């Protein structure tokens, strides 16, 4: 029920704990686009999954990850990004504390 934000101020917004070393903040969205900050402790795992009807592009804001998309695997660090189009399996493993992915997708 919370309204989307014109301005997302990170240090004014609390974390939503997800368990197993992962927490997130839904940052803002429109009808067509959504941005979420996902924070991982070292060794936390974004279990591999796919989205049937939408694309995803994620920015590495901090730290580093091993990212596997449809069987290809790269170590990404802050500044890097990855693409997973609809129906592509993707997952991530944090390589260090305070590793952050900024997920964007079409909700």
């Amino acid at each position: 029920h919370m309204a989307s934000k014109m301005f997302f101020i990170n240090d004014e917004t609390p974390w939503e704990e997800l368990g197993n070393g992962i927490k997130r903040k839904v940052m803002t969205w429109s009808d067509d686009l959504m941005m979420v900050c996902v924070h991982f402790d070292k060794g936390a795992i974004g279990v591999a999954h796919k989205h049937d009807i939408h694309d995803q592009i994620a920015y590495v804001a901090a730290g580093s990850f091993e990212v596997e998309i449809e069987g290809q695997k790269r170590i990404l660090k802050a500044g890097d990004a990855y693409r997973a189009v609809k129906n592509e399996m993707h997952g991530a493993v944090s390589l260090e504390d305070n590793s952050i992915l900024i997920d964007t997708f079409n909700p």
């Binding site: 992962i22 997130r24 979420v36 991982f40 974004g46 993707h90």
Partner: peptide, 8 residues
């Protein structure tokens, strides 16, 4: 997302 979780 980069994790398995959905946001209801």
């Amino acid at each position: 997302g980069s994790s398995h979780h959905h946001h209801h």
